[PDB]
Amino acid sequence: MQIFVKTLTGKTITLEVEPSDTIENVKAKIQDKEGIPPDQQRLIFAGKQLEDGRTLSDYNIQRESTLHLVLRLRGG
């Protein structure tokens, strides 16, 4: 299946995934495609922040579902 990850910068990432993929695995794919490290990423679906050790099917994420990505910010 495919899912979409909308960023707050107005861009939409498309990802090929399996329902049994862990959120951690989805983050690693976002790193491979977009270059963003997993530890900086927070993924949200339907009001819930998604946990690294759970899977897409655990949150009932389906084909063409849209997740949202927000990044950790760190400076100094």
Binding site: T7, L8, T9, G10, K11, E34, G35, I36, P37, Q40, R42, I44, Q49, H68, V70, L71, R72, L73, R74, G75, G76
Partner: protein, 187 residues
Amino acid sequence: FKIHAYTEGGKPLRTIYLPKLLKKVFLDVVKPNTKKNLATCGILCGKLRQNAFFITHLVIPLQEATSDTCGTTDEASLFEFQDKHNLLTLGWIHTHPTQTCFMSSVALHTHCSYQLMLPEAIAIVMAPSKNTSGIFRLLDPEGLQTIVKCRKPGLFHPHEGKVYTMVAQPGHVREINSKLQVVDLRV
């Protein structure tokens, strides 16, 4: 008055309008922190109109800090806020309470991810004890590639090569006299 901004790699960058007031107003809202020698960070938020970005809001997220770092802590509530009001992230800003004006490796790693999603993303650093500031971005593509490839341990560590640059004056960032709204989500 028409500006064409090109990255090193030949990519054209859209204009970002930045309110003149933002730097001053940012230092004002984060002053209690600055005076306690604590770094503070903020988000540059705005809208896309007619192929151009406008920074309309300075958002101060929930965060933690030391004299040498700041970091957001509840990005889900920040997403909620931005999502509800249809605010894009166009960049960010932070203070160096006692340090000179520069992008650290921490800031560079943070900003790389934003710039990869939005080629126009900018990072503003205020150094109020020096009374200096600057607006920065990574060299595109080489600077971004350097940070993407980096696996060096240590919160702060050095990089080979120039990596980043101050935005051109004039450049894709255009400072205008404009209204400004600050949203402070802190608790």
